[PDB]
């Protein structure tokens, strides 16, 4: 039977679970073709690889398995979105422009080494239009980075003259004459893709952040008494803002479980006010909810764009509050407004170069080290604005006769007569020196205090120059060690453990390639995701004996069916090798 076994290997899934006998058992099932196809994608695999990194730095109890299943049912929704969008001599001479073009081409080549990319007939074409934008959002985003370097290159030719060709900011291309009309065209083209980036993001990403948020609220209402039993935290905004969505008649819109309302009513509705549950949480005419599933479900006629006024205003206010507080969407909103504000005849289009960072991979990796210790790195600066001040009060009333700027016959500028203008001298000029405030201050010689100044300067150079700048240069250096040690620990633990059992490779190496197949052939955290897609797409009357046992525990959110400590070989070691 080698032909059929060879042909059906890609589709024959396999997982090991523990249940129904307190013994580990294997489970076989059919992995669909489309489910297999949607898993081998560049987007999904990176999402999975991101999850593995997160779960292994913050790792604990079955919380890991809770995170795994919560991730397992996120990509399922992500897959649903992805399905519905697809249809010794003298060298030459170098002028400024030539060198500028060469160096800018070098910079752009370095960056690109990232390689980033009637009233009824409109509806069918508009859906294709939005499906088009969502389909290619990264390529269109990468296009903005093109136009951010293109516009800024053109902006690199301005000049200032009091007489127009009250200063006049006139361009001055090499008469190529081309640059000026190009800027008008390129700026208009830029703000278009900046607008299209929002619409592409809105129809592609935020359906996944609404589903994610509605997921936990439904979990914390059914399996917890978030708003029923105890309260929210009264300090957490997110736990408080979503109080507005319970009353809405369409609370579980994106999320699958549209009967989560009736579930909490049966659970907490007895020992609590059965009527009071039915007013905190929608359920208008709780009696009519009983009779809703009695006769039938009449279908209203499609009256889109005509009586589409029937929209949950309260729900939409909730949804906007979730979107407008998103960190990524706000950035995309900020990118657009500056481009819009860039058409105010200005350079503001020079701030769209910073995307260079929140873009390239290695470039943002470096910014992580700076921002890894951002909280601590501010304190050192705060400690450098204390120490410098603490020197001012010492030099304000002992060494006043020195902080002059050598104006002849008159001294209107003594930078220590006033405290405020002395603290400004020690911070602006004292720190930025290389010698401290001994370099920019008269030479103490003879002056009875010429040993109270030498002790004063060298202490200043020692403390607020060498040490308090070897910390800022030392916090960044340690940041790289902190981050690289993380990646080494992530790779090490992933390689020497099964991530589903706890068993190390020492036990799975008594046989050749024992561990290599264990995390590939046996339970390998990828058939498990394929198992849930199998159950949810299979009616309950056909669930086999093992499949319904899992489906029972999954709906109870008890994850005891994962092996976690024993895998079919420690179980059956003595029986057959």
Which residues are part of a known binding site for caffeine? 256
Closest approach, Cβ 387 to Zn ion, in A, equals 48
Helix, strand or coil, per DSSP, at residue 27:
strand
CA atoms of 532 and 528, how far apart (whole Å): 7
Closest approach, Cβ 506 to its own copies, in A, equals 8
472 binds its own copies (CB under 8 A): yes
164 binds its own copies (CB under 8 A): no
Closest approach, Cβ 51 to its own copies, in A, equals 22
Class of residue 134 by CB neighbours under 10 A (exposed 0-12, middle 13-18, buried 19+) = buried
376 binds its own copies (CB under 8 A): yes
**What stretch of H or E contains 28?**
strand 24-30
Q: Which residues contact 530 (CB under 8 A, 6 or more apart)?
A: 13, 29, 31, 35, 36, 39
Site for its own copies in 536-565 (CB under 8 A): 560, 564-565
Closest approach, Cβ 539 to its own copies, in A, equals 31
Place of tokens 């010698």: 435
Figure out which of the listed residues 85, 501, 533, 550 binds Zn ion, where binding follows CB under 5 A.
Answer: 501
Q: Report residue 364 as tokens.
A: 């943002």
498 binds, among its own copies, Zn ion, none (CB under 5 to 8 A by kind): Zn ion
Binding site feature residues: 45-49, 256, 494-499, 519-525, 541
Q: For the chain, how far is it from start to end, CA to CA, in angstroms?
A: 24
Site for its own copies in 33-72 (CB under 8 A): 61-62
Binding site feature residues for ATP: 45-49, 494-499, 519-525
Figure out which of the listed residues 126, 274, 484, 557 binds its own copies, where binding follows CB under 8 A.
Answer: 484
Site for Zn ion in 227-286 (CB under 5 A): none
Q: Report residue 389 as tokens.
A: 């001040």
Closest approach, Cβ 229 to its own copies, in A, equals 24
Closest approach, Cβ 19 to Zn ion, in A, equals 16
Length of the chain: 577
Q: Looking at residue 252, what DSSP letter applies?
A: S
Query: From residue 330 to residue 349, what is the string marking binding to its own copies with x (rule CB under 8 A)?
Result: ----------------xx--
Site for its own copies in 169-198 (CB under 8 A): 169, 172
| Dihedral sign (CA 555, 558, 563, 566) | negative
567 binds, among Zn ion, its own copies, none (CB under 5 to 8 A by kind): Zn ion
Site for Zn ion in 479-498 (CB under 5 A): 498
37 binds, among its own copies, Zn ion, none (CB under 5 to 8 A by kind): none
102 binds its own copies (CB under 8 A): no
Closest approach, Cβ 63 to its own copies, in A, equals 10
CA atoms of 550 and 480, how far apart (whole Å): 44
15 binds Zn ion (CB under 5 A): no
Class of residue 95 by CB neighbours under 10 A (exposed 0-12, middle 13-18, buried 19+) = exposed
Figure out which of the listed residues 176, 459, 510, 537 binds its own copies, where binding follows CB under 8 A.
Answer: 510
CA atoms of 301 and 428, how far apart (whole Å): 72
Give, in degrees to the nearest 5, the angle at Cα 112 between 350 and 157.
35
Nearer to its own copies, 7 or 344 (CB): 344
Region near its own copies per CB under 8 A, out of 78-86, 292-300, 367-375, 523-531: 367-375
Region near its own copies per CB under 8 A, out of 41-49, 66-74, 411-419, 531-539: 411-419
Nearer to its own copies, 62 or 285 (CB): 62
407 binds its own copies (CB under 8 A): no
156 binds, among Zn ion, its own copies, none (CB under 5 to 8 A by kind): its own copies
- Extended beta strands in 450-536, E state: none
Site for its own copies in 194-223 (CB under 8 A): none
Whose CA is closest to 72, among 554, 509, 503, 420?
Answer: 554
Closest approach, Cβ 66 to Zn ion, in A, equals 18
> Mind spelling out the 3-state secondary structure of 309-367?
CCCCHHHHHHHHHHHHCCHHHHHHHHHHHHHHHHCCCCCHHHCCCHHHCCCCHHHHHHH
Number of residues that bind its own copies (CB under 8 A): 110
Q: How many CB atoms lie within 10 A of CB 207?
A: 18
309 binds, among its own copies, Zn ion, none (CB under 5 to 8 A by kind): none
Binding site feature residues for Ca(2+): 541
Whose CA is closest to 73, among 576, 465, 397, 531?
Answer: 531
- What are the angstrom distances between the C-alpha of 305 and each of 128, 311, 312? 18, 12, 15
Q: 24-30 and 12-18 as β-strands: parallel, antiparallel, unpaired?
A: antiparallel
CA atoms of 524 and 543, how far apart (whole Å): 23
Query: From residue 116 to residue 155, what is the string marking binding to its own copies with x (rule CB under 8 A)?
Result: ------------------------------------x--x
Question: Rule CB under 5 A: which residues touch Zn ion?
Answer: 498, 500-501, 567
């Amino acid at each position: 039977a080698e032909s059929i076994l060879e042909y059906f290997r890609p589709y024959l899934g396999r997982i090991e679970i523990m249940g129904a006998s307190r013994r580990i058992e294997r489970i076989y099932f059919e992995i669909s073709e489309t489910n297999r196809a949607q898993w081998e994608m560049p987007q999904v695999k990176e999402s999975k690889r991101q999850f593995i990194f997160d779960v292994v730095n913050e790792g604990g109890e079955a919380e890991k398995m809770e995170l795994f299943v919560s991730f397992c049912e996120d990509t399922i929704f992500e897959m649903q979105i992805a399905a519905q969008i697809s249809e010794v001599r003298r060298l030459r001479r170098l002028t400024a422009r030539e060198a500028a073009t060469a160096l800018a081409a070098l910079l752009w080549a370095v960056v690109a080494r990232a390689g980033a990319a009637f009233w009824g007939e409109l509806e069918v074409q508009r859906v294709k239009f939005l499906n088009y934008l969502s389909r290619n959002f990264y390529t269109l985003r990468f296009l903005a980075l093109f136009l951010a370097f293109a516009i800024n290159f053109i902006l690199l030719f301005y000049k200032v003259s009091d007489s127009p060709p009250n200063m006049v900011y006139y361009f001055l291309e090499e008469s190529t004459g081309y640059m000026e009309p190009a800027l008008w065209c390129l700026s208009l083209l830029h703000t278009l893709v900046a607008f299209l980036c929002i619409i592409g993001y809105n129809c592609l990403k935020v359906p996944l952040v609404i589903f994610k948020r509605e997921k936990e609220l439904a979990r914390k209402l059914e399996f917890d008494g978030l708003y029923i039993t105890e309260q929210p935290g009264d300090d957490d905004v997110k736990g408080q803002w979503d109080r507005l969505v319970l009353n809405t008649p369409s609370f579980p819109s994106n999320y699958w479980d549209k009967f989560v309302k009736r579930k909490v009513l049966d659970k907490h509705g007895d020992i609590f006010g059965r009527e009071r549950i039915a007013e905190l949480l929608g359920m208008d005419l709780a009696s009519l909810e009983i009779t809703a599933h009695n006769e039938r479900k009449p279908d209203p006629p499609p009256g889109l764009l005509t009586w589409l006024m029937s929209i949950d205003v309260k729900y939409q206010i909730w949804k906007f509050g979730v979107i407008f507080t998103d960190n990524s969407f706000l950035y995309l909103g900020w990118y657009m407004v500056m481009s819009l504000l860039g058409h105010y005849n200005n350079f503001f289009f020079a701030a769209h170069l910073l995307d260079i960072a929140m873009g390239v991979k290695t470039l943002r990796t470096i910014l992580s080290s700076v921002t890894h210790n951002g909280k601590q790195l501010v304190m050192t600066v705060g400690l450098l604005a204390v120490v410098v001040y603490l020197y001012t009060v010492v030099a304000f009333n002992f060494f006043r006769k020195f902080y002059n700027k050598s104006e002849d016959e008159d001294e209107p500028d003594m930078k220590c007569d006033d405290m405020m203008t002395c603290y400004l001298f020690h911070m602006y000029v004292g720190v930025r020196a290389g010698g401290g405030i001994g370099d920019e201050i008269e030479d103490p010689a003879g002056d009875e205090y010429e040993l109270y100044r030498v002790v004063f300067d060298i202490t200043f150079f020692f403390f607020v120059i060498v040490i308090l700048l070897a910390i800022i240069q030392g916090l960044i250096i340690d940041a790289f060690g902190e981050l690289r040690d993380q990646q080494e620990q992530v790779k090490e633990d992933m390689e020497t453990k099964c991530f589903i059992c706890g068993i190390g490779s020492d036990y799975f190496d008594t046989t050749p390639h024992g561990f290599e197949t264990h995390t590939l052939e046996e339970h390998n955290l990828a058939n498990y995701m394929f198992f849930l897609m199998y159950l949810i797409n299979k009616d309950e009357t056909e669930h086999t004996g093992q499949e319904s046992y899992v489906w029972k525990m999954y709906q109870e959110r008890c994850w005891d069916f994962f092996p976690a400590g024993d895998c079919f070989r420690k179980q059956y070691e003595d029986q057959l090798s």
